[PDB]
Amino acid sequence: AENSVAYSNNSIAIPTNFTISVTTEILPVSMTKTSVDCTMYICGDSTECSNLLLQYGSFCTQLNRALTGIAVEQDKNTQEVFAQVKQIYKTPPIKDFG
Partner 1 sequence: PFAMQMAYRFNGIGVTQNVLYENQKLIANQFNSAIGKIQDSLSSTASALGKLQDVVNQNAQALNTLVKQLSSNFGAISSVLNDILSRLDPPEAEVQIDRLITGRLQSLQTYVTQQLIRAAEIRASANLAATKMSECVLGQSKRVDFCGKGYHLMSFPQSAPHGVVFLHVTYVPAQEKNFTTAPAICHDGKAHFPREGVFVSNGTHWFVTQRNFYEPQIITTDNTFVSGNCDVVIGIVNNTVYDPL
Partner 2 sequence: DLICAQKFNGLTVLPPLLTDEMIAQYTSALLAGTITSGWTFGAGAALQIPFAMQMAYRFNGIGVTQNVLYENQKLIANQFNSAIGKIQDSLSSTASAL
Ligand X SMILES: *[C@@H]1O[C@H](CO)[C@@H](O)[C@H](O)[C@H]1NC(C)=O
**What distance in Å separates the CA atoms of residue 38 and residue 43, rounded to the nearest whole number?**
8
Q: Are 78 and 26 in contact (CB under 8 A)?
A: no
1 binds, among its own copies, partner 1, partner 2, none (CB under 5 to 8 A by kind): its own copies
To partner 2, the closest distance from the beta carbon of 37 in angstroms equals 4
Q: How far apart are the first and last CA of the chain?
A: 40
To partner 1, the closest distance from the beta carbon of 12 in angstroms equals 4
Q: Tell me which H or E stretch contains 48.
A: helix 47-52
* Site for partner 2 contains 61 (CB under 8 A): no
51 binds, among partner 2, partner 1, its own copies, none (CB under 5 to 8 A by kind): none
Q: Which residues bind ligand X (CB under 6 A)?
A: 6, 9-10, 13
